[PDB]
Design a protein around this motif. Structure first.
Motif, PDB file in Angstrom:
ATOM      1  N   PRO A  46       0.822  -1.216   0.000  1.00 54.10           N
ATOM      2  CA  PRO A  46       0.000   0.000   0.000  1.00 54.10           C
ATOM      3  C   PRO A  46       0.855   1.265   0.000  1.00 54.10           C
ATOM      4  O   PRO A  46       0.478   2.264  -0.623  1.00 54.10           O
ATOM      5  N   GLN A  47       1.988   1.211   0.698  1.00 57.56           N
ATOM      6  CA  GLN A  47       2.909   2.338   0.778  1.00 57.56           C
ATOM      7  C   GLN A  47       3.583   2.566  -0.571  1.00 57.56           C
ATOM      8  O   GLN A  47       3.518   3.657  -1.131  1.00 57.56           O
ATOM      9  N   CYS A  48       4.237   1.523  -1.079  1.00 56.09           N
ATOM     10  CA  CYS A  48       4.908   1.565  -2.377  1.00 56.09           C
ATOM     11  C   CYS A  48       3.979   2.034  -3.478  1.00 56.09           C
ATOM     12  O   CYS A  48       4.422   2.626  -4.461  1.00 56.09           O
ATOM     13  N   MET A  49       2.690   1.752  -3.317  1.00 53.98           N
ATOM     14  CA  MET A  49       1.691   2.203  -4.276  1.00 53.98           C
ATOM     15  C   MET A  49       1.534   3.712  -4.182  1.00 53.98           C
ATOM     16  O   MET A  49       1.493   4.401  -5.195  1.00 53.98           O
ATOM     17  N   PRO A 109      10.348  -5.362   0.445  1.00 56.09           N
ATOM     18  CA  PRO A 109      11.784  -5.135   0.249  1.00 56.09           C
ATOM     19  C   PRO A 109      12.102  -3.656  -0.002  1.00 56.09           C
ATOM     20  O   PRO A 109      13.137  -3.160   0.457  1.00 56.09           O
ATOM     21  N   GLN A 110      11.208  -2.970  -0.719  1.00 57.84           N
ATOM     22  CA  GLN A 110      11.356  -1.550  -1.030  1.00 57.84           C
ATOM     23  C   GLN A 110      11.185  -0.709   0.233  1.00 57.84           C
ATOM     24  O   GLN A 110      12.053   0.086   0.577  1.00 57.84           O
ATOM     25  N   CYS A 111      10.056  -0.882   0.913  1.00 57.05           N
ATOM     26  CA  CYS A 111       9.785  -0.157   2.150  1.00 57.05           C
ATOM     27  C   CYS A 111      10.899  -0.356   3.171  1.00 57.05           C
ATOM     28  O   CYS A 111      11.150   0.506   4.012  1.00 57.05           O
TER      29      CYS A 111
HETATM   30 ZN   LIG Z   1       6.601  -1.087   0.103  1.00 53.24          ZN
END
Ligand SMILES: [Zn+2]
Lengths: 303, 303
Positions: free
Chosen positions: A250-253, B250-252
């Motif tokens: 949801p964040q990465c989005m 992995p990104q977060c």
């Molecule tokens: Zn993320």
């Protein structure tokens, strides 16, 4: 045509500056570009004025104020210089008293006289192509502006009588016998640097940024300042953007949403720039093997 | 003590400025702070000079160049003013010709004369506490600098003979009969504003940023510029940082790593500042109910 191919192709290029208001994977970009350039040129040099010894931290090796072949490559050499040191090194090495009385009327002649000698050294080592990694903060373009600062100082010195013979002759040597001519022969040296800097066949600049508001703003101010300095620029790489079209976090989005609307603005403002898009790597890019593999995305669009 | 409690407590406070080089949830912060302040004060005003009508977009309502009670609250009023308009409004309303000849020697007297009248209006409406939402770009502190700009112009006018009676008297009215005294009575009006701005019991500033490199840099330059302006500051809120200790994306994870190292720098540089940490909200904060719930994290540390 979103790829830095056009730099490897233009073989007339002798100086390539890369800069961007820090925090945007600028150093990784400088390196990746130097590696790729070393594959298609005889002799490549990668110099950095970022005091944070960012160049060392990236390759693993330690670099310093003189050219050392980079471990893992034939023709790639790297040096890491700090001006504030080169300043006190060159002044004590002498006059600067006079230069001080110069220093307040002309802000940053010391920083510029430094750059003047740094360049004369680079020129003497005759590298086919040299990549400049600018500082991440303050005036990212001090280097390209050094002829300007010198030329002012030379205007202030022309009206000065003799007795400044010491400092005029002292400036003359750190750049490149006697008379008023030597005062006019520096002017010819300066004019030379300027010509090269301002000649698109010989030197271009590549901006790097990330797809956020602040980074777009500071980047525009830098491109305006550039056209003002008459330095050519036609590449801009945008880093740490995340482009997996269907992501579940949801964040990465949210991130991706914001990013994609600013990347839309960029694409539009710079029709005349190769805008190259490269992803956010989860691991920090380190080592002469991680770098090689990363440099890939600078010459081959990533999907 | 990571929370803006110390602002609700200090009841002597009359002006609170909030600013930060845009893209950092600055507007959300201004609002959240205005709501919380309204719970503990008689009359609160939230004014914004961000031309992007960011204040409207946040509450749903439309606000304008005059105070309108905010839908959902008893004592909270909001106005949204653009200087460039207030400039052409006040000039045609007249002389400015003279002011122009002033305009090039003194850059931004028009923008400062505007601020001078905006303030006299706010003062007249007598709110217990007013929260200023500064612009996201350019000189974020123009407002606090307006007395300075005026005082220069008054120095240039003092040496001027009569016949400028028109413009001196014209300036005098937009701030607050005749003689040279009226020329010295503005000086007293200016001196008044300055005293208040510079008096920690009456007016303080709150910086907002995000935990990235560029935002730290621009934020330091802003705090230096502040102490230089002699304006007090002892709060700094860091937004859109993601703090779920054990996250699986992995990104977060990468994001959080970077963030956490800069948040570490902040915590250290500003021992003397209430540094309040607030999370990245997945949805855009909009509506007088989403805002109420968000303002929570400004007075109660979030975990
Ligand atoms: Zn993320």
């Amino acid at each position: 045509p979103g790829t830095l191919e056009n730099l490897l192709e233009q073989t007339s290029l002798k100086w390539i500056f890369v800069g961007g208001k820090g925090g945007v994977g600028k150093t990784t970009t400088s390196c990746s570009l130097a590696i790729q350039m070393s594959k298609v040129r005889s002799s490549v040099l990668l110099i950095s004025t970022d005091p944070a010894h960012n160049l060392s931290d990236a390759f693993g090796t330690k670099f310093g104020k003189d050219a050392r072949k980079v471990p893992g490559f034939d023709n790639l050499s790297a040096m890491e210089i700090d001006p504030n040191l080169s300043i006190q090194e060159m002044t004590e090495q002498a006059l600067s008293g006079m230069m001080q009385d110069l220093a307040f009327t002309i802000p940053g002649i010391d920083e510029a006289l430094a750059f003047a000698e740094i360049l004369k050294q680079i020129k003497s080592m005759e590298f086919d192509c040299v990549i400049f990694d600018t500082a991440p903060t303050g005036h990212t373009l001090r280097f390209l502006n050094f002829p300007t600062v010198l030329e002012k100082a030379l205007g202030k010195l022309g009206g000065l009588s003799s007795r400044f013979g010491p400092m005029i002759n002292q400036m003359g040597s750190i750049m490149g016998q006697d008379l008023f001519g030597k005062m006019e022969s520096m002017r010819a040296n300066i004019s030379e640097v300027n010509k090269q800097f301002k000649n698109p066949d010989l030197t271009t600049f590549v901006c790097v940024c990330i797809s956020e508001f602040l980074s777009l703003y500071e980047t525009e101010r830098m491109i305006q300042e550039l056209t003002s300095y008459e330095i050519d620029t036609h590449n801009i790489v945008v880093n740490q953007l995340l482009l997996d079209p269907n992501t579940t976090c949801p964040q990465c989005m949210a991130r991706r949403k914001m990013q994609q609307k600013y990347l839309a603005q960029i694409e539009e403002l710079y029709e005349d720039f190769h805008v190259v898009k490269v992803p956010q790597v989860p691991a920090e890019v380190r080592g002469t093997e991680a770098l090689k593999s990363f440099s890939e995305m600078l010459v081959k669009p990533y999907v």
